[PDB]
Amino acid sequence: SKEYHIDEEVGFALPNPQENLPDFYNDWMFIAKHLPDLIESERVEKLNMLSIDHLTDHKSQRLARLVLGCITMAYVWGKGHGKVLPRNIAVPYCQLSKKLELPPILVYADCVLANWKKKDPNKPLTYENMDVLFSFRDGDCSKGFFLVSLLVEIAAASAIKVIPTVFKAMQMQERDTLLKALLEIASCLEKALQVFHQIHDHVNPKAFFSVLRIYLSGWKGNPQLSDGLVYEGFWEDPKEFAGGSAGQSSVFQCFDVLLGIQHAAQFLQDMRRYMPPAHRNFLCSLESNPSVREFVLSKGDAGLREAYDACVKALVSLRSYHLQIVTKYILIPASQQPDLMNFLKTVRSTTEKSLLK
Amino acid sequence: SKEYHIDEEVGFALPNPQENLPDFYNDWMFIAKHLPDLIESGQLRERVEKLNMLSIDHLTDHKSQRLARLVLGCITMAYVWGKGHVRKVLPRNIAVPYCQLSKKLELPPILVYADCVLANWKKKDPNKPLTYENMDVLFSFRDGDCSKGFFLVSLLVEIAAASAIKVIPTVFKAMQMQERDTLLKALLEIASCLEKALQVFHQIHDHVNPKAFFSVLRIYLSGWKGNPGLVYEGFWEDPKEFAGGSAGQSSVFQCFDVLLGIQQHAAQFLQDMRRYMPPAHRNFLCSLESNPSVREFVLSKGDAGLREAYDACVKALVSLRSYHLQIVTKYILIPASQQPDLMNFLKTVRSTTEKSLLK
Numbered sequence: 180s181k182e183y184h185i186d187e188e189v190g191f192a193l194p195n196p197q198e199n200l201p202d203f204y205n206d207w208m209f210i211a212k213h214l215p216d217l218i219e220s221e222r223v224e225k226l227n228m229l230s231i232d233h234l235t236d237h238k239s240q241r242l243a244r245l246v247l248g249c250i251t252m253a254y255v256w257g258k259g260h261g262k263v264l265p266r267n268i269a270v271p272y273c274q275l276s277k278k279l280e281l282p283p284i285l286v287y288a289d290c291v292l293a294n295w296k297k298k299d300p301n302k303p304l305t306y307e308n309m310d311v312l313f314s315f316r317d318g319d320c321s322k323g324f325f326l327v328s329l330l331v332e333i334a335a336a337s338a339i340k341v342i343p344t345v346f347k348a349m350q351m352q353e354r355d356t357l358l359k360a361l362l363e364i365a366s367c368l369e370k371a372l373q374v375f376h377q378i379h380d381h382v383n384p385k386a387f388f389s390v391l392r393i394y395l396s397g398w399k400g401n402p403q404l405s406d407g408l409v410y411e412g413f414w415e416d417p418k419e420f421a422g423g424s425a426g427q428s429s430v431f432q433c434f435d436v437l438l439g440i441q442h443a444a445q446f447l448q449d450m451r452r453y454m455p456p457a458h459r460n461f462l463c464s465l466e467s468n469p470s471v472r473e474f475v476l477s478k479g480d481a482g483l484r485e486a487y488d489a490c491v492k493a494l495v496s497l498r499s500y501h502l503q504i505v506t507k508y509i510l511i512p513a514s515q516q517p518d519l520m521n522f523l524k525t526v527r528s529t530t531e532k533s534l535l536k
Numbered sequence: 537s538k539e540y541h542i543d544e545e546v547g548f549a550l551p552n553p554q555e556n557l558p559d560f561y562n563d564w565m566f567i568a569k570h571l572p573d574l575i576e577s578g579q580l581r582e583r584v585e586k587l588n589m590l591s592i593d594h595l596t597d598h599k600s601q602r603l604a605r606l607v608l609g610c611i612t613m614a615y616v617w618g619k620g621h622v623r624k625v626l627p628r629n630i631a632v633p634y635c636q637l638s639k640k641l642e643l644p645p646i647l648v649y650a651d652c653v654l655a656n657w658k659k660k661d662p663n664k665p666l667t668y669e670n671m672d673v674l675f676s677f678r679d680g681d682c683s684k685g686f687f688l689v690s691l692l693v694e695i696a697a698a699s700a701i702k703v704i705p706t707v708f709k710a711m712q713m714q715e716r717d718t719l720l721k722a723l724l725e726i727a728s729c730l731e732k733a734l735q736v737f738h739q740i741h742d743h744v745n746p747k748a749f750f751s752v753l754r755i756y757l758s759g760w761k762g763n764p765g766l767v768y769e770g771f772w773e774d775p776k777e778f779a780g781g782s783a784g785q786s787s788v789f790q791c792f793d794v795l796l797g798i799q800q801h802a803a804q805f806l807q808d809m810r811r812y813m814p815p816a817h818r819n820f821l822c823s824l825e826s827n828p829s830v831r832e833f834v835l836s837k838g839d840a841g842l843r844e845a846y847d848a849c850v851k852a853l854v855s856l857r858s859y860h861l862q863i864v865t866k867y868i869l870i871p872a873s874q875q876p877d878l879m880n881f882l883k884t885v886r887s888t889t890e891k892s893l894l895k
């Protein structure tokens with residue numbers, strides 16, 4: 180559906196992202212494409228300031244934001260062992276973030292949604308035929324963690340395209356249409372769970388926790404940048420922004436809203452700001468529609484209740500397996516080097532309490 | 537509109553709010569309607585504690601549920617604050633129905649602008665118009681609190697603003713259709729209506745007394761988020777923080793900012809205030825942000841008339857925010873300097889409005 184930038188094949192992800200920028204931005208593209216070699220070894224501070232006026236289409240500006248976002252995270256965090264962004268990169272990065280109405284920091288819509296290519300376009304969207312555009316460090320497992328995340332967004336697209344059928348069937352008092360629409364969403368959410376199983380085959384817990392997780396960290400409520408980060412020449416004062424979480428996906432928040440599932444309440448709302456404007460306009464168009472919960476309860480129909488519940492159950496399954504992934508990839512590795520669980524459990528609890536029975 | 541519950545006459549306010557609940561809720565209605573007498577005699581907190589737990593299942597329409605929230609909200613503020621000289625636990629037999637009724641209406645369990653302004657008025661004679669002389673409130677806290685004046689004058693500003701809100705589709709349609717003469721008239725009509733809202737502000741001086749406001753009424757509008765939380769017995773085992781009433785709970789304040797492209801620590805506060813607004817009204821301010829920028833449209837065009845009409849709106853907003861500040865001065869600053877960061881926030885918002893002028 181065109182106005183909201185939801186793709187029929189990949190949903191919220193960006194279809195066929197640009198891989199190359201105009202020559203004018205070669206200095207950017209060289210740094211971003213060589214980050215593994217370049218981190219172990221100043222070029223950002225010796226970098227001239229480029230105008231953003233030569234980024235003319237949407238995909239170019241998304242790729243440019245991805246390039247500048249990966250550069251910024253690597254400059255701030257370095258080698259990842261232990262506060263001011265140079266004017267000549269921050270001014271174009273903040274200008275390009277302002278234009279696209281996103282915060283000047285690496286966000287899920289950059290390094291997942293806009294950070295993939297097909298290897299051969301004549302074949303389908305599977306891990307074996309897919310790759311990422313940018314990494315941080317050799318062995319960071321960027322490829323696996325980004326692509327498996329993206330394959331979940333694609334699986335979710337199968338359900339999102341069913342979403343006009345739900346509201347049309349409510350308007351037209353069509354009980355049999357709405358039931359099939361809910362079961363199809365439920366079935367697609369159940370197939371998304373099977374993708375989650377793929378993380379184990381492409382992402383290594385240690386590599387994730389001690390390498391990749393430092394470069395997705397932001398600077399809002401971070402003790403290393405207690406006052407935040409200074410974007411030299413744009414604000415004289417340092418500014419806080421969060422870094423990447425699963426909460427920046429629209430997938431997670433989208434089906435809460437649809438199914439009428441209502442401190443963590445605060446966090447998912449702010450995460451929407453870190454989403455593309457079209458996608459936030461979509462989640463709002465959703466909240467303006469009649470409650471699927473009020474509709475299914477008001478009918479007294481037990482078939483409809485089971486289908487609504489089929490959706491809610493598929494979400495609880497996902498949130499449990501999510502939780503189990505956090506156990507393998509954060510809790511256990513943290514107990515090996517010499518409040519995230521509370522947030523996830525609370526969100527899971529609110530979902531489970533939304534069953535009808 | 538329709539889906540957003542914006543009325544052509546009163547805008548964001550609730551039209552013709554219910555005044556009476558079903559008999560089943562007489563025990564509630566007695567306390568709320570007699571809060572002045574029951575606080576002054578020391579019988580308020582006893583009447584709340586001798587209260588059986590009532591099901592909310594007999595509140596069947598919207599207006600009934602809005603009135604019940606107002607009744608329970610006024611009771612809660614009086615129970616928490618007492619004689620204004622407090623209670624850390626709200627008794628289960630009122631908190632459970634109040635929290636249940638808040639969940640249904642998707643509002644926080646505390647008295648909010650949509651309760652004691654938007655849903656808390658009646659006409660004296662319906663055959664005559666909406667003026668202070670023909671209007672009254674449903675609930676007060678204390679004899680002499682000047683609740684009537686402060687609530688109704690607050691609401692009369694919301695009503696003046698409604699005249700402009702219904703123009704808001706004309707603005708977006710006229711941009712889409714490249715109709716330059718239509719869009720100009722739409723801004724001037726909004727500006728003129730924003731200018732009439734300023735004339736309502738003048739009425740506060742005739743119906744609200746500064747001392748009465750600061751030392752009485754302001755105690756019963758105090759919340760418990762960042763207040764030097766409250767336990768809702770039987771609903772949460774843990775105490776919960778929620779803010780009390782501010783002018784920020786109006787949609788009026790944010791609505792014309794969004795239209796005009798006015799970008800409003802304080803960015804966070806106006807954003808959090810939206811939760812204390814009705815869900816339909818939160819969907820409207822959000823549906824607004826999804827529309828094209830009126831600022832970017834007027835600027836790309838070389839037409840100076842359009843700039844002056846956009847500025848006419850922005851200027852009318854700056855006028856209101858200056859006079860706002862002067863009202864804050866009379867009703868807080870001076871009485872506080874007589875007893876033995878809101879000013880920073882208000883000036884900042886004025887600066888952001890003023891800095892959005894085109895000239």
Ligand SMILES: CC(C)CN(c1ccc(-n2cccc2C(=O)O)cc1NC(=O)Nc1ccc(Cl)cc1F)C1CCCCC1
Nearest residue numbers: 286287291325327328331375378395423424425428504505
């Ligand atoms: C698609 C999402 C909703 C579910 N997944 C997921 C599950 C658990 C975790 N997780 C592990 C430890 C802590 C967390 C957490 O914080 O939740 C993270 C994610 N996903 C991201 O972190 N995505 C992401 C965010 C920001 C930036 Cl910048 C880049 C990114 F790639 C996919 C699903 C299938 C298995 C692979 C991961």
Ligand SMILES: CC(C)CN(c1ccc(-n2cccc2C(=O)O)cc1NC(=O)Nc1ccc(Cl)cc1F)C1CCCCC1
Nearest residue numbers: 648649653686687689690693737740781782783786863864
């Ligand atoms: C409606 C807004 C945009 C402008 N006004 C306004 C101006 C200054 C102040 N003020 C004074 C001292 C501190 C403050 C402050 O904190 O701003 C308050 C209000 N208005 C409310 O506070 N309304 C209200 C809110 C919450 C609850 Cl619960 C109940 C209520 F009645 C009206 C407009 C009509 C002329 C009288 C004032």
